[model samples]
Target: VLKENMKTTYHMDGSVDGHYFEIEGEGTGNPFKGEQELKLRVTKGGPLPFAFDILSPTFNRVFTDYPEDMPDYFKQSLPEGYSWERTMMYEDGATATASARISLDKNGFVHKSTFHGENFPANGPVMKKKGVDWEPSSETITPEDGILKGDVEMFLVLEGGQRLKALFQTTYKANKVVKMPPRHKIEHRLVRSEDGETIQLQEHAVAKYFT
Candidate 1:
């Protein structure tokens, strides 16, 4: 399971705080391979610490080359959507749920994507009281050898007291998910581009905002 292999450490230096995590694995039987790493250090504690009455959350990630039929464990994950060739789901469950279903799309030679996430403290009278449970997702796309590869990153403050960050990279050729397949019968709520350039700009933008 990813939970066991996942590694994230919290560092504190005076009032400055940072969270770093790395995921690297390879095996013939492993569905998730390659490396997903990031170092997020904020000069200030940022918005997570005092955000909500969060507790420790159960984090989960699901990936499928075929979105037409997802694994049973993906039951409570992201909801199925139309036009998503390949699907990825990220969930941080503490206040019941906070999830994002990111779908990659290919329109001829143009690559595109979409994000739909709800159940956070986004819409309602829960502004200052709860804070924003999740920040806007970060996305990057670059054309490489005719394949427009992409990467995605998301952050959330779960009901449990933890800052959840998820990142994944993929190629456009792998975006073969069907649009609004039978799976759309299920349910869900809704709501970037770069390359090796990384998310330094996006990260800085977020950190600056929260500061």
Candidate 2:
């Protein structure tokens, strides 16, 4: 049996705040990997503190609709939004997608998400980038001791040749999972091309934590 819950923690080198989570279910052995229904509560604390309200949530991340578990500090932040978003999926003889993405606009605000998966728009949204130019790429990984990984990279070029890039990395592991295919960790980072500087946010869970 697999562990019913996972947790997330932040680093001070790069800080963020929000309550961002979703209903995720899948197997890495599957063609689509996994699918999730997003339920976001964007707080000043970002995705750091309020991240994983697990099953039997004592602030359990794997569980849901438990606002009381939320602390007082975050109330000083942003509000919550309800929506159903599940993608990166293929099931019931459904089709799969090349990739899924989330981004901010040139003005630095959240842009409407574009999804690709079974029963969703295949072409995705018409992304009109106000940024000067951009190119996106990805990498797939096979980690040790039954861990598989998937990664995506982003390059956003603004005016005057200013460049910014981000790396989205995730590792998968699971129960009875040799070729461990469940996601163990997720990391988003900023990379400066000129100097090769990097700032990243990462969280991981130990499958051994489960019986």
Candidate 3:
């Protein structure tokens, strides 16, 4: 099993002023024993197509005690004075599908409890003993003119020897007359200590939505 922590941010028209959640999971020894971190941001509107990034064995310590003198490749870009709303998992189990209804303030801080479920197979995960995986589903939302619709899925391998995976699907339907933004970009980075003892991995996926 993998320890998972998720952070999701919904944006209005590309400016982020929405909700976010931090979900932390426990560790297991199933060759996938590690922590998972998810971060999402919406850059457009109208059934917005979203992108997600995953970090396995996602050590939070790196952010807590960031290096003052950052390397060329490593940059500290997190927003200042940002507080996170966290939800921790108590039971070590798996689910087929899950959903959460979140609320956020103007400063991007999370509010009260959100609605989360584990029964929507079309948009959640089908977790197994080894790791969590996705069950494919179809979408019916179509795009008009400059709008686009798309979906994405990603997987990660942790440093402490674990595995993580996730999926994101969205539909973009344009309304007035607006130029379509460039296709979203997904990037990944794997870093290891000089001694090859410590490892860090990050993965991301971005794309246009299609009905």
Candidate 4:
């Protein structure tokens, strides 16, 4: 019963730019972490190896309010006049819903929608009801889900309204069974045709669950 119900996108004013791909059963314990390999060509260049980090559960539920109650380090890193408006919803029963967007600044920055809560359904008590006595820990965990599909888009705005755009889509999967040291390493690959560029990006971890 894999549910491709999770989504995130980029929006500006009333226009939606960029894209999002859905993944089923992603949670705080197992998210889309690690690097995405890019094999593509630029306008005149050949294939290049580039990587981007696709880390989910960007922020923990440690605060009553997200970015607002976030620590000084997060607050201090944000550029001046940055737009990071967010919203939360509690539709579809117990599953909580949240989304946010950010506008690019002159500092040549890129922003991905940060995930807050566990992305999967709440089933802890249900597991306990089955006498599994399961709890999130560092030594044991149930294999839930893995990274499936990914897409990355970049919009470069040059002077005088000149816009440059590129997108790469990839399909890859990674997973590991549990015994001890719960976390596992995962990876993905995003590719272009010819004359492409590759850039490796890593996510700032809130927990050392992913290596």
Query: How much lDDT does candidate 1 score?
Result: 0.27
Give the winner by TM-score. 3
TM-score: the better of candidates 2 and 4: 2
What are the lDDT figures for the candidates, one per model? 0.27, 0.24, 0.25, 0.23
TM values, all candidates: 0.23, 0.25, 0.26, 0.18
lDDT order of candidates, best first? Answer: 1, 3, 2, 4
- The all-Cα superposition gives candidate 2 an RMSD in Å to the true structure of 19.7
Candidate 3 per-residue lDDT over residues 106-152, each given as its tens digit: 43322122222232122222222132222222222223355444343
TM-score of 4: 0.18
Q: What is the RMSD, in Å, between candidate 4 and the native fold over all Cα?
A: 21.5
Q: Give the TM-score of candidate 3.
A: 0.26
Which residues of candidate 3, in runs, are more than 4 Å off? 1-115, 119-146, 156-159, 172-177, 182-184, 188-211
Question: How many residue pairs clash per model?
Answer: 13, 17, 7, 7
**Which pairs, if any, clash in model 3?**
5-23, 32-162, 97-118, 149-209, 149-210, 150-209, 150-210
Q: What is the C-alpha lDDT profile of model 4 across 1-211, one tens digit per residue?
A: 1112211122111111122222211111111222122221122211211111111222111111112222222223223212222222222122222333322343322333433222222342211122111111121112324322323342323234433333323222222221222233222222212222332222222323343
* Better candidate number, 1 or 4, judged by lDDT: 1
lDDT per residue for candidate 1 within 1-211, as digits (tens), equals 2321223222222210122222111111111321123233333333333222221111112221123243222212223321222223334321222222223223111112222223333432222333335454444444344233445554544444455654444433322332221211111011111134221111111100110
